Amino acid sequence: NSVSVDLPGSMKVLVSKSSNADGKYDLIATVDALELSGTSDKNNGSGVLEGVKADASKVKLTISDDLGQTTLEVFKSDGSTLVSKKVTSKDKSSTEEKFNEKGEVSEKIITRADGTRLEYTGIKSDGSGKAKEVLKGYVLEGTLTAEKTTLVVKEGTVTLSKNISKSGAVSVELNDTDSSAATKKTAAWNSGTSTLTITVNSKKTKDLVFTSSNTITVQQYDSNGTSLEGSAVEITKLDEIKNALK
């Protein structure tokens, strides 16, 4: 009878070959040992399935009509308040949330399609909390407010701040408390190329590029302070960001 359908979020659903007397299709899925079941208006594996955890928490799997997105939710045993929600979007990125007793989000883990992550923890009712970005090879740490995420790396008297706005726009700034003009770093941000250019003693020294691939690269200028030299090097560990700030 049934037809297996592959779903975003590493799940499968079995949809009946034919519809019932009401025209509806039966859906069955097994998600981490839990058996979920439902009925659907459509014949392609989309719709709603429900079951329960061993501890009586309610579970619902919602598959969008075009199979592009899945939502896996856990609720209190009466089904009233959310406990956890995982949404896998059509790019196969995911958001995984936990909620407090009021249904307010207390943790949000974003896994980008490329596997890098934003981890927001200890989220309060104002949308503030702790923030981490998990990149390939290293992690950046900072805070979340309702206005932006700010991830901070410190080296000497330099503080590098990577900001991710509420709308997702990246900007980077550098601030150095160094008194000496021979050694003080300053930097300018180019939003078009996502590039922070560092200057010391009125000469450009380095370009730090925050790529659309969620990597950081560093390239030096010649001693003339005007032309780039060599080729950009991808950062592989936090120590190499610190090196770029020296």
Q: Write the CATH number for 158.
A: 3.90.930.1
Instruction: Kindly state whether residues 110 and 219 are assigned to the same domain.
Output: yes
Q: What CA–CA distances, in Å, run from 214 to 111, 147, 151, 172, 208?
A: 12, 21, 14, 13, 13
The domain total for the chain is: 2
Q: What are the helix (H) ranges across 78-148?
A: none
Instruction: Kindly state whether residues 214 and 148 are assigned to the same domain.
Output: yes
Q: How many CA atoms lie within 13 A of 134 on its CB side?
A: 12
Instruction: Kindly state whether residues 142 and 210 are assigned to the same domain.
Output: yes
List the CATH number of the domain containing 26: 2.40.128.160
Contact 131, 143 (CB under 8 A): yes
As to burial, measured by CB atoms within 10 angstroms (0-12 exposed, 13-18 middle, 19+ buried), residue 95 is: middle
Strand pairing category for 3-7 and 148-155 = unpaired
Question: Among 121, 110, 119, 65, which Cα is nearest to 88's?
Answer: 110
Token output for 191? 């939003």
Instruction: Kindly state whether residues 116 and 235 are assigned to the same domain.
Output: yes
Contact 176, 166 (CB under 8 A): no
Contact 62, 50 (CB under 8 A): no
Distance (Å, rounded) from C-alpha 117 to C-alpha 95? 10
DSSP letters for 155-203: ETTEEEEEEEETT--EEEEEEE----TTT-EEEEEETTTTEEEEEETTE
Contact 60, 70 (CB under 8 A): no
3-state secondary structure of 39: strand
Alpha-carbon 210 to chain mean position: 16
Instruction: Kindly state whether residues 115 and 77 are assigned to the same domain.
Output: no
Angle (nearest 5°) at CA 59 between 93 and 32 = 65
- Residue ending a domain, among 100, 116, 139, is 100
3-state secondary structure of 242: helix
Question: Among 141, 149, 135, 143, which Cα is nearest to 214's?
Answer: 135
Instruction: Kindly state whether residues 165 and 93 are assigned to the same domain.
Output: no
Instruction: Kindly state whether residues 211 and 117 are assigned to the same domain.
Output: yes
Q: In one letter, which amino acid is 44? A: N
**DSSP letter assigned to residue 213:** T
Instruction: Kindly state whether residues 107 and 43 are assigned to the same domain.
Output: no
Distance (Å, rounded) from C-alpha 25 to C-alpha 20? 6
Instruction: Kindly state whether residues 131 and 79 are assigned to the same domain.
Output: no
- Residue ending a domain, among 100, 130, 158, is 100
**Residues whose CB falls within 8 Å of the CB of residue 178, separated by 6 or more in sequence, listed in order:** 156, 157, 158, 184, 185
Ranges assigned E (strand) in 32-182? 34-40, 47-52, 58-63, 70-75, 82-88, 94-99, 105-111, 117-121, 129-135, 138-144, 148-155, 158-165, 170-176
- Residue ending a domain, among 100, 135, 168, is 100
Contact 221, 229 (CB under 8 A): yes
Question: Among 139, 192, 135, 145, which Cα is nearest to 165's?
Answer: 145
Method: X-ray
* 92: containing domain: 1-100
Instruction: Kindly state whether residues 28 and 2 are assigned to the same domain.
Output: yes
